[PDB]
Amino acid sequence: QTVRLTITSRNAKAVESVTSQLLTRARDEKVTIHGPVRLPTRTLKITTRKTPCGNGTNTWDTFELKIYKRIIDLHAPTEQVKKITSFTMESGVDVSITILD
Amino acid sequence: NKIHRIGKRKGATLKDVSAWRWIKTAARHFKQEGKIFVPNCTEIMKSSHGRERAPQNPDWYYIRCAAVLRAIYLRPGVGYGGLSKRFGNKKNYGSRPEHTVTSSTGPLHWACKSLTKLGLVEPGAQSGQRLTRKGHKFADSLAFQVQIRKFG
Amino acid sequence: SYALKQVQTFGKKKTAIAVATVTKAAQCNIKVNGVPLQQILPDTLRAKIMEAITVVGSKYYSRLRIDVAVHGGGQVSQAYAARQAIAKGLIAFFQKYHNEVEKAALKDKFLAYDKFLLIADPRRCEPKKWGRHSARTRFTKSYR
Amino acid sequence: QAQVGLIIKVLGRTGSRGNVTQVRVRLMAEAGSPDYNRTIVRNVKGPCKENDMLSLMETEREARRL
Amino acid sequence: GKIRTKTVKRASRQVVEKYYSKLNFDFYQNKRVIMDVTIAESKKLKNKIAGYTTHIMKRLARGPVRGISLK
Amino acid sequence: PPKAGQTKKAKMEAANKGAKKTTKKWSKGQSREALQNAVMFDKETYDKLRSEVPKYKLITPSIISDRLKIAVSIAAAGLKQLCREKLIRLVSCSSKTRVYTRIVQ
Amino acid sequence: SLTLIPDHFQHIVRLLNTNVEGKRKVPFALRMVKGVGIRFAYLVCKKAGIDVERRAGTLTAEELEKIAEIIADPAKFKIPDWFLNRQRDPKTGKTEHLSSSMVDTRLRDDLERLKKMRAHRGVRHAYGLRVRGQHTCTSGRH
Amino acid sequence: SSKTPKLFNKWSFEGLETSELALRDHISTTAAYVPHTSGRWQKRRFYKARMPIVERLANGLMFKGRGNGRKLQAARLLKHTLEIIHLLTDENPLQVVVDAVSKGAPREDSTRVRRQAVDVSPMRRVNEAIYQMCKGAREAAFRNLKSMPECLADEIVNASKGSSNSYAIKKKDEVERVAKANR
RNA sequence: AUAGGAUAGCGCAUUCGGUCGAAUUCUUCUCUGCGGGAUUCCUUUGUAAUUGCACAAGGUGAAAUUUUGGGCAACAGCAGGUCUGUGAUGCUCCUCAAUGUUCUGGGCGACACGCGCACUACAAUGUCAGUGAGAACAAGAAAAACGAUCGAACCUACUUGAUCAAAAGAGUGGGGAAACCCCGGAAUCACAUAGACCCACUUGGGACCGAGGAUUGCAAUUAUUGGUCGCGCAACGAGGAAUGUCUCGUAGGCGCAGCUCAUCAAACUGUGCCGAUUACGUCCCU
Ligand SMILES: [K+]
Ligand SMILES: [K+]
Ligand SMILES: [K+]
Ligand SMILES: [Mg+2]
Ligand SMILES: [Mg+2]
Ligand SMILES: [Mg+2]
Ligand SMILES: [Mg+2]
Ligand SMILES: [Mg+2]
Ligand SMILES: [Mg+2]
Ligand SMILES: [Mg+2]
Ligand SMILES: [Mg+2]
Ligand SMILES: [Mg+2]
Ligand code: NA
Ligand code: NA
Ligand code: NA
């Protein structure tokens, strides 16, 4: 029974300080792992004018938000997986449990 | 010399010959056989609303059906929306910028119906249009004829 | 049985990536996206892809089947990407299955004709900037 | 009708807008000729480099130094 | 325009003073020494320091250089 | 705004009423004479094509139109016929352009 | 076409009371008459069964009579309803295809009809203004 | 098995040369199959002088907004131009091109403070020859039954002979006539 | 070949993303978090040096000089713009037939005219009608509402409509988005298409206007927007004096997406595609 581990966050450093921990805890659990895949980084772009009144040279503000996503597929039961995931993550990182068929 | 086999090479298939020659030779074969169904609407209607004039070739439906069959050979499971992209063009909108418009799927629907009646196309399982075994055999055999330079 | 002799190379003109699979076969056969060399249009782009053969000679492609799959880019950048993948494939095959005196004469012949036959062009599209219609040109200015 | 001159050295861009270059040229003539190995200073329009050849078609004038 | 700013020149003069014995006439081996004997946020500056330390060493082999004091 | 000094409403109104038409034609133009080119072959013109057009070193639909005072559409049609009967040979060919020349001997 | 010019070739052809250039190809000389366009003239040649590759000056007297009948009553020759320029006349209610002086006469009727009821479109036409909701500022100006 | 390239597989570069002693180092007769090469010829100041002369001719046909960026089209126009050139002159069209370039630009010009005659550098003579020939053919074919390759071939053939029927030669004669008067 | 040229092949012959077939192997292309890599590093009987700081050509190289393109950007100011972004605000004005707030209708679009910035052109290096090969950045659906935790809004593919125009209208399935769209069939482009036109305000150019029909919306008249047939006899055949932007994947050309968006891009913000001429300077003008 394959369980899918989806990790996504705004922070590049925090998004893989949990995947490394999830990878390590499962290696201590001896469960076969399909390696953490780095899904494409999606950038949210918002381009607005700098001015609040429409005066002067029309200068613009490019704002970007990057999303980092990883997935780990492991052949482990629900109870064993819950042991792997039962630890404190950092703020701004959410981990999703999914069962594949 | 020009039609001789290169050497250690036998026969031909689709994509091995010129796409225009295959389509021209297929349309000639469709007209000579006479079994293909040609709608009456093709005598007045335009191939697409992106075009501003009706087709100038009296055998434009025969060419379109041959072109559709080759398209189904290259991309099995293709529908009328997919073929509309292949046969689309850029429309003149007057004093306003030109934009790409896909071909009308009506003529492509008629063309797929005519080829289905001929037994050359099978509605693919789980969506799309696919060639039949007779259609695949017809495509390669005609491609060999073009390479041989028979040309009907 | 006979061991399989096969290599893979790529070309990188603009956004076009062409991956050529060169293998030992009974008869020479080079196809780009399934289209043979003699069927590639226009004749000017066909002559460019054929340059990956004629600079060294047809004798070096004698028993090689090359399947170039080109994706991305446009018709011209796909031709320059494909002709580089073919030329790099012959060098890679001769490096793997031939001595070094060969494939060094071949490499010199390729580079003496066109450096871009073996080395990818670094040029890439320059981004558009605001207040500009493209990379360089600015908005029209009226002083009265 | 025209005599070929070889640019010996570039003496600098001449005048405003820098479109004219002052050069020193050596007249390319056969040995023993009156023009053999003789040198004049000339004004050149266009991009010029050392060891560049010009057809002078008149070798009597000399450009004023600048 | 490839002038070494005073941050690169001062740091490369400090490295020669402190690790003269370990340095050499080549960029690549010197750059390896600069990598672990320096703390910097930028690899480019470490690359420019390694380029100028080698320039100092080639200058030192020909004679004394102002700003370098080797006891 | 650049409000003009001492400009009236009557001055305004008289300005727009006189601003219609008048100033134009900033180019010389230099008009040309019309080209009277026949759209179909006459007996004497068709005779020239079958005899005079061969043994021309360079043959082109636009050249033949300039000689026989005919349209290029039918000038090209006659040239395609002269090739069918091997009187002229085709040296360069494309969809838009054809070049012919006379045969040897 | 490599066909000799007939002795009856005419440079100007009369059809529905308008001069038609005989040097032009038939589908492109038939559009010289009002109410017949490029798309309609090709349909007339097909209904008349004549070759579109011929010049208009080679049309015979009976051929001109045939193409004039199809122009006058296209729906009689199996030309569909949607191909016509008066599908439901606001006065008579009958589908037709105007041609030659009928296009101009019916257009004058249309404007006179709108003017009499004093509709907004009629008022714009009377004043010589744009009627399709266009900004007339900085436009026209002859 | 390697073979020397021929332009459009028809015209041989062997024996190609410039009659002028000048422009010998600024006209490239390097063998090629097609005018289309994708090289960074503008990176160095005189690197464009190493571009094959037929490609420099092709680049000169990509003018105006409707011709900008059309190099495959310009190569096809040159394919027919060389065939027409061969019929007109019965020589190598590659050689006729080289002779047309060598004669197409004035040797002396005037500039500028008072107007004075100045010599023209060899790089500018090749640039102006390609520019004036393509410009003269472009305007000749603008509203004309004559095709573009036919107008371009007639221009190159006249410039190769030095005849005043060529736009480049007619322009060259007036530039030198003024330059002589400004000595 | 109905005339059929040029262009690779000379232990096992090629194809078949619907043949929606299995097994095995792997990371050549693709995804990416940290790294590496380039710095005047190397060489001139070069410039300069008479210490140096450097410079120019070439080399190495994917990249050779702020590597390329951006972001950030001091201190002093301007009576520059914004009190029409805010529950940012002092003073002052109106305050129950109100300058508050709703609702109906109109207006913001109104045209003798002048100006800025775009779009489309004036054609044959073309317009039509076919056929081929072919990108990249991106966007996609809903509540403490409403129905029985999902399910409907959002985007699409396939089929149908179709026993006969387009635009439509329907049914089914998929997609919370590297999963469906999607093997993303963009347009420039190409075609030896043996296609039509043939120099003319013309099959260039579509302004303007007429009649039918469909869709968005509570509402289409002052045409909302498509699609069909007509008008095209509206100028326009390259633009006076003047004047803008630009140095290489650049200008110019060509589309595509997002954004405004119930409906509506001649806009902007990005994106890729085809791709040059000229200069490698100067202080004449600003
Ligand atoms: K700033
Ligand atoms: K400040
Ligand atoms: K502006
Ligand atoms: Mg257009
Ligand atoms: Mg348009
Ligand atoms: Mg446009
Ligand atoms: Mg870009
Ligand atoms: Mg200050
Ligand atoms: Mg209100
Ligand atoms: Mg307003
Ligand atoms: Mg309507
Ligand atoms: Mg706006
Ligand atoms: Na012309
Ligand atoms: Na206030
Ligand atoms: Na100045």
mmCIF file of N, CA, C and O in Angstrom, chain C residues 30-95:
data_model
loop_
_atom_site.group_PDB
_atom_site.id
_atom_site.type_symbol
_atom_site.label_atom_id
_atom_site.label_comp_id
_atom_site.label_asym_id
_atom_site.label_seq_id
_atom_site.Cartn_x
_atom_site.Cartn_y
_atom_site.Cartn_z
ATOM 1 N N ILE C 30 19.011 8.256 -41.745
ATOM 2 C CA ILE C 30 18.871 9.400 -40.850
ATOM 3 C C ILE C 30 17.491 10.003 -41.066
ATOM 4 O O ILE C 30 17.144 10.380 -42.192
ATOM 5 N N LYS C 31 16.710 10.093 -39.993
ATOM 6 C CA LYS C 31 15.377 10.672 -40.036
ATOM 7 C C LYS C 31 15.238 11.705 -38.928
ATOM 8 O O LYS C 31 15.661 11.468 -37.794
ATOM 9 N N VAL C 32 14.641 12.844 -39.258
ATOM 10 C CA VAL C 32 14.396 13.915 -38.300
ATOM 11 C C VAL C 32 12.898 13.956 -38.035
ATOM 12 O O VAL C 32 12.112 14.292 -38.929
ATOM 13 N N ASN C 33 12.507 13.616 -36.806
ATOM 14 C CA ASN C 33 11.100 13.501 -36.415
ATOM 15 C C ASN C 33 10.353 12.491 -37.284
ATOM 16 O O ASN C 33 9.150 12.626 -37.517
ATOM 17 N N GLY C 34 11.056 11.470 -37.763
ATOM 18 C CA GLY C 34 10.471 10.478 -38.638
ATOM 19 C C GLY C 34 10.499 10.826 -40.109
ATOM 20 O O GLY C 34 10.130 9.981 -40.935
ATOM 21 N N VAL C 35 10.921 12.030 -40.464
ATOM 22 C CA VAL C 35 10.992 12.476 -41.852
ATOM 23 C C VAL C 35 12.410 12.236 -42.359
ATOM 24 O O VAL C 35 13.365 12.696 -41.721
ATOM 25 N N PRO C 36 12.590 11.526 -43.471
ATOM 26 C CA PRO C 36 13.938 11.319 -44.013
ATOM 27 C C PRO C 36 14.584 12.632 -44.427
ATOM 28 O O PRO C 36 13.936 13.673 -44.553
ATOM 29 N N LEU C 37 15.901 12.571 -44.638
ATOM 30 C CA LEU C 37 16.655 13.766 -45.005
ATOM 31 C C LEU C 37 16.203 14.325 -46.348
ATOM 32 O O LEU C 37 16.105 15.544 -46.520
ATOM 33 N N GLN C 38 15.930 13.449 -47.316
ATOM 34 C CA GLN C 38 15.583 13.899 -48.657
ATOM 35 C C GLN C 38 14.206 14.551 -48.718
ATOM 36 O O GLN C 38 13.883 15.191 -49.724
ATOM 37 N N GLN C 39 13.390 14.401 -47.678
ATOM 38 C CA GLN C 39 12.045 14.959 -47.649
ATOM 39 C C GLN C 39 11.929 16.213 -46.793
ATOM 40 O O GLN C 39 10.816 16.706 -46.594
ATOM 41 N N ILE C 40 13.038 16.740 -46.285
ATOM 42 C CA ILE C 40 12.994 17.904 -45.408
ATOM 43 C C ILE C 40 12.882 19.168 -46.251
ATOM 44 O O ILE C 40 13.651 19.368 -47.199
ATOM 45 N N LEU C 41 11.918 20.020 -45.913
ATOM 46 C CA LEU C 41 11.691 21.278 -46.601
ATOM 47 C C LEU C 41 11.927 22.446 -45.652
ATOM 48 O O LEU C 41 11.594 22.361 -44.466
ATOM 49 N N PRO C 42 12.493 23.558 -46.140
ATOM 50 C CA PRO C 42 12.908 23.849 -47.518
ATOM 51 C C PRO C 42 14.245 23.219 -47.886
ATOM 52 O O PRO C 42 14.887 22.575 -47.064
ATOM 53 N N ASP C 43 14.680 23.394 -49.136
ATOM 54 C CA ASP C 43 15.980 22.879 -49.550
ATOM 55 C C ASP C 43 17.124 23.578 -48.827
ATOM 56 O O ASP C 43 18.210 23.005 -48.692
ATOM 57 N N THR C 44 16.908 24.813 -48.366
ATOM 58 C CA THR C 44 17.970 25.534 -47.672
ATOM 59 C C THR C 44 18.179 24.991 -46.264
ATOM 60 O O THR C 44 19.315 24.916 -45.786
ATOM 61 N N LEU C 45 17.095 24.614 -45.581
ATOM 62 C CA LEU C 45 17.241 23.985 -44.273
ATOM 63 C C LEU C 45 17.680 22.533 -44.396
ATOM 64 O O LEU C 45 18.338 22.010 -43.490
ATOM 65 N N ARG C 46 17.320 21.863 -45.494
ATOM 66 C CA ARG C 46 17.812 20.509 -45.720
ATOM 67 C C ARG C 46 19.318 20.507 -45.948
ATOM 68 O O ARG C 46 20.025 19.607 -45.481
ATOM 69 N N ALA C 47 19.827 21.513 -46.663
ATOM 70 C CA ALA C 47 21.262 21.597 -46.908
ATOM 71 C C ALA C 47 22.032 21.847 -45.618
ATOM 72 O O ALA C 47 23.194 21.447 -45.495
ATOM 73 N N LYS C 48 21.406 22.517 -44.649
ATOM 74 C CA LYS C 48 22.064 22.740 -43.366
ATOM 75 C C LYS C 48 22.179 21.445 -42.573
ATOM 76 O O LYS C 48 23.231 21.156 -41.992
ATOM 77 N N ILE C 49 21.106 20.655 -42.531
ATOM 78 C CA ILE C 49 21.152 19.377 -41.827
ATOM 79 C C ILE C 49 22.092 18.413 -42.540
ATOM 80 O O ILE C 49 22.803 17.628 -41.900
ATOM 81 N N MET C 50 22.126 18.466 -43.872
ATOM 82 C CA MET C 50 23.050 17.636 -44.633
ATOM 83 C C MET C 50 24.503 18.028 -44.408
ATOM 84 O O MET C 50 25.396 17.215 -44.664
ATOM 85 N N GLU C 51 24.761 19.252 -43.942
ATOM 86 C CA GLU C 51 26.128 19.675 -43.658
ATOM 87 C C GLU C 51 26.748 18.876 -42.522
ATOM 88 O O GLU C 51 27.976 18.801 -42.431
ATOM 89 N N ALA C 52 25.931 18.278 -41.656
ATOM 90 C CA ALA C 52 26.455 17.392 -40.627
ATOM 91 C C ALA C 52 27.048 16.117 -41.207
ATOM 92 O O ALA C 52 27.712 15.375 -40.477
ATOM 93 N N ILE C 53 26.820 15.848 -42.489
ATOM 94 C CA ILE C 53 27.337 14.665 -43.153
ATOM 95 C C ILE C 53 28.472 15.005 -44.110
ATOM 96 O O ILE C 53 29.503 14.330 -44.119
ATOM 97 N N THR C 54 28.302 16.050 -44.918
ATOM 98 C CA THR C 54 29.193 16.269 -46.050
ATOM 99 C C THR C 54 30.553 16.817 -45.631
ATOM 100 O O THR C 54 31.540 16.614 -46.347
ATOM 101 N N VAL C 55 30.635 17.504 -44.490
ATOM 102 C CA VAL C 55 31.907 18.086 -44.070
ATOM 103 C C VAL C 55 32.919 16.994 -43.744
ATOM 104 O O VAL C 55 34.116 17.138 -44.017
ATOM 105 N N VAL C 56 32.464 15.890 -43.158
ATOM 106 C CA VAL C 56 33.363 14.774 -42.874
ATOM 107 C C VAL C 56 33.359 13.753 -44.005
ATOM 108 O O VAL C 56 34.407 13.208 -44.357
ATOM 109 N N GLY C 57 32.196 13.484 -44.590
ATOM 110 C CA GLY C 57 32.083 12.489 -45.638
ATOM 111 C C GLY C 57 31.030 11.447 -45.328
ATOM 112 O O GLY C 57 30.832 11.086 -44.166
ATOM 113 N N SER C 58 30.346 10.953 -46.361
ATOM 114 C CA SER C 58 29.291 9.968 -46.155
ATOM 115 C C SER C 58 29.831 8.622 -45.691
ATOM 116 O O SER C 58 29.058 7.808 -45.176
ATOM 117 N N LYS C 59 31.130 8.369 -45.860
ATOM 118 C CA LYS C 59 31.696 7.083 -45.472
ATOM 119 C C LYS C 59 31.716 6.885 -43.963
ATOM 120 O O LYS C 59 31.764 5.739 -43.503
ATOM 121 N N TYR C 60 31.682 7.965 -43.184
ATOM 122 C CA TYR C 60 31.695 7.853 -41.732
ATOM 123 C C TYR C 60 30.317 7.582 -41.147
ATOM 124 O O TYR C 60 30.221 7.243 -39.963
ATOM 125 N N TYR C 61 29.257 7.712 -41.944
ATOM 126 C CA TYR C 61 27.897 7.395 -41.530
ATOM 127 C C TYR C 61 27.414 6.081 -42.132
ATOM 128 O O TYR C 61 26.209 5.892 -42.321
ATOM 129 N N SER C 62 28.337 5.163 -42.430
ATOM 130 C CA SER C 62 28.030 4.052 -43.326
ATOM 131 C C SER C 62 26.947 3.141 -42.759
ATOM 132 O O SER C 62 25.946 2.863 -43.426
ATOM 133 N N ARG C 63 27.121 2.672 -41.528
ATOM 134 C CA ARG C 63 26.217 1.685 -40.950
ATOM 135 C C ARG C 63 25.449 2.251 -39.761
ATOM 136 O O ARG C 63 25.071 1.513 -38.851
ATOM 137 N N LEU C 64 25.204 3.557 -39.762
ATOM 138 C CA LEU C 64 24.613 4.248 -38.626
ATOM 139 C C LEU C 64 23.176 4.640 -38.937
ATOM 140 O O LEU C 64 22.900 5.226 -39.988
ATOM 141 N N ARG C 65 22.270 4.315 -38.021
ATOM 142 C CA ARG C 65 20.889 4.776 -38.067
ATOM 143 C C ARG C 65 20.729 5.853 -37.004
ATOM 144 O O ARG C 65 20.989 5.607 -35.821
ATOM 145 N N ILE C 66 20.334 7.050 -37.426
ATOM 146 C CA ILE C 66 20.223 8.204 -36.542
ATOM 147 C C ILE C 66 18.768 8.646 -36.519
ATOM 148 O O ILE C 66 18.188 8.955 -37.567
ATOM 149 N N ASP C 67 18.180 8.675 -35.326
ATOM 150 C CA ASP C 67 16.801 9.112 -35.121
ATOM 151 C C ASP C 67 16.836 10.388 -34.290
ATOM 152 O O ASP C 67 16.950 10.333 -33.063
ATOM 153 N N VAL C 68 16.732 11.534 -34.953
ATOM 154 C CA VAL C 68 16.734 12.826 -34.278
ATOM 155 C C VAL C 68 15.292 13.215 -33.977
ATOM 156 O O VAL C 68 14.452 13.265 -34.880
ATOM 157 N N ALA C 69 15.005 13.480 -32.708
ATOM 158 C CA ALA C 69 13.702 13.960 -32.266
ATOM 159 C C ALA C 69 13.881 15.388 -31.770
ATOM 160 O O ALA C 69 14.541 15.617 -30.752
ATOM 161 N N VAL C 70 13.293 16.343 -32.486
ATOM 162 C CA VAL C 70 13.467 17.764 -32.214
ATOM 163 C C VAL C 70 12.169 18.314 -31.645
ATOM 164 O O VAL C 70 11.095 18.116 -32.226
ATOM 165 N N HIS C 71 12.266 19.005 -30.513
ATOM 166 C CA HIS C 71 11.121 19.635 -29.876
ATOM 167 C C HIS C 71 11.482 21.057 -29.472
ATOM 168 O O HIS C 71 12.646 21.368 -29.210
ATOM 169 N N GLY C 72 10.471 21.918 -29.429
ATOM 170 C CA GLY C 72 10.666 23.310 -29.084
ATOM 171 C C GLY C 72 11.168 24.133 -30.257
ATOM 172 O O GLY C 72 11.526 23.621 -31.317
ATOM 173 N N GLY C 73 11.183 25.447 -30.056
ATOM 174 C CA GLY C 73 11.738 26.338 -31.055
ATOM 175 C C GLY C 73 10.866 26.473 -32.295
ATOM 176 O O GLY C 73 9.674 26.161 -32.302
ATOM 177 N N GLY C 74 11.494 26.964 -33.363
ATOM 178 C CA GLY C 74 10.853 27.118 -34.647
ATOM 179 C C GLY C 74 11.565 26.307 -35.717
ATOM 180 O O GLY C 74 12.531 25.595 -35.446
ATOM 181 N N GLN C 75 11.077 26.452 -36.951
ATOM 182 C CA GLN C 75 11.535 25.576 -38.026
ATOM 183 C C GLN C 75 13.024 25.750 -38.302
ATOM 184 O O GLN C 75 13.713 24.781 -38.643
ATOM 185 N N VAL C 76 13.543 26.971 -38.164
ATOM 186 C CA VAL C 76 14.953 27.206 -38.461
ATOM 187 C C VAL C 76 15.824 26.787 -37.283
ATOM 188 O O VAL C 76 16.871 26.154 -37.460
ATOM 189 N N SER C 77 15.410 27.134 -36.063
ATOM 190 C CA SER C 77 16.191 26.754 -34.890
ATOM 191 C C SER C 77 16.142 25.249 -34.660
ATOM 192 O O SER C 77 17.042 24.681 -34.033
ATOM 193 N N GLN C 78 15.093 24.587 -35.153
ATOM 194 C CA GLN C 78 15.032 23.133 -35.069
ATOM 195 C C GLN C 78 15.997 22.485 -36.051
ATOM 196 O O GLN C 78 16.522 21.397 -35.793
ATOM 197 N N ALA C 79 16.236 23.135 -37.192
ATOM 198 C CA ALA C 79 17.189 22.605 -38.160
ATOM 199 C C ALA C 79 18.619 22.724 -37.649
ATOM 200 O O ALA C 79 19.423 21.799 -37.810
ATOM 201 N N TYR C 80 18.956 23.859 -37.034
ATOM 202 C CA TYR C 80 20.304 24.040 -36.507
ATOM 203 C C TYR C 80 20.536 23.171 -35.279
ATOM 204 O O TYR C 80 21.663 22.737 -35.019
ATOM 205 N N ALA C 81 19.482 22.917 -34.502
ATOM 206 C CA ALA C 81 19.602 21.999 -33.378
ATOM 207 C C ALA C 81 19.760 20.562 -33.859
ATOM 208 O O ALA C 81 20.512 19.781 -33.268
ATOM 209 N N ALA C 82 19.055 20.196 -34.932
ATOM 210 C CA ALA C 82 19.125 18.829 -35.439
ATOM 211 C C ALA C 82 20.470 18.545 -36.094
ATOM 212 O O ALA C 82 21.028 17.454 -35.929
ATOM 213 N N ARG C 83 21.006 19.508 -36.847
ATOM 214 C CA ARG C 83 22.276 19.282 -37.528
ATOM 215 C C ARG C 83 23.431 19.220 -36.539
ATOM 216 O O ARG C 83 24.465 18.606 -36.820
ATOM 217 N N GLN C 84 23.277 19.856 -35.376
ATOM 218 C CA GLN C 84 24.305 19.769 -34.345
ATOM 219 C C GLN C 84 24.237 18.435 -33.614
ATOM 220 O O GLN C 84 25.268 17.880 -33.220
ATOM 221 N N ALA C 85 23.028 17.903 -33.427
ATOM 222 C CA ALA C 85 22.880 16.616 -32.756
ATOM 223 C C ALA C 85 23.427 15.482 -33.612
ATOM 224 O O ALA C 85 23.976 14.507 -33.087
ATOM 225 N N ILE C 86 23.275 15.584 -34.934
ATOM 226 C CA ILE C 86 23.828 14.570 -35.829
ATOM 227 C C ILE C 86 25.349 14.609 -35.795
ATOM 228 O O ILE C 86 26.014 13.572 -35.690
ATOM 229 N N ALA C 87 25.923 15.811 -35.887
ATOM 230 C CA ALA C 87 27.375 15.951 -35.888
ATOM 231 C C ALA C 87 27.973 15.514 -34.557
ATOM 232 O O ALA C 87 29.023 14.863 -34.519
ATOM 233 N N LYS C 88 27.321 15.873 -33.451
ATOM 234 C CA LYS C 88 27.792 15.437 -32.140
ATOM 235 C C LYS C 88 27.614 13.939 -31.952
ATOM 236 O O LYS C 88 28.394 13.312 -31.228
ATOM 237 N N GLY C 89 26.592 13.353 -32.579
ATOM 238 C CA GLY C 89 26.390 11.918 -32.467
ATOM 239 C C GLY C 89 27.486 11.114 -33.136
ATOM 240 O O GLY C 89 27.901 10.071 -32.626
ATOM 241 N N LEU C 90 27.959 11.576 -34.294
ATOM 242 C CA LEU C 90 29.058 10.889 -34.966
ATOM 243 C C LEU C 90 30.335 10.957 -34.141
ATOM 244 O O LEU C 90 31.083 9.977 -34.060
ATOM 245 N N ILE C 91 30.606 12.111 -33.528
ATOM 246 C CA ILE C 91 31.779 12.239 -32.668
ATOM 247 C C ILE C 91 31.646 11.333 -31.451
ATOM 248 O O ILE C 91 32.606 10.665 -31.046
ATOM 249 N N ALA C 92 30.457 11.297 -30.846
ATOM 250 C CA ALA C 92 30.241 10.453 -29.676
ATOM 251 C C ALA C 92 30.365 8.975 -30.024
ATOM 252 O O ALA C 92 30.923 8.195 -29.245
ATOM 253 N N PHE C 93 29.833 8.566 -31.178
ATOM 254 C CA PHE C 93 29.953 7.174 -31.596
ATOM 255 C C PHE C 93 31.407 6.794 -31.840
ATOM 256 O O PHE C 93 31.859 5.727 -31.413
ATOM 257 N N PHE C 94 32.156 7.660 -32.524
ATOM 258 C CA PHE C 94 33.560 7.376 -32.788
ATOM 259 C C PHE C 94 34.392 7.427 -31.514
ATOM 260 O O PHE C 94 35.392 6.712 -31.400
ATOM 261 N N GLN C 95 34.012 8.270 -30.554
ATOM 262 C CA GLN C 95 34.696 8.266 -29.266
ATOM 263 C C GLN C 95 34.480 6.947 -28.535
ATOM 264 O O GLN C 95 35.412 6.402 -27.932
#
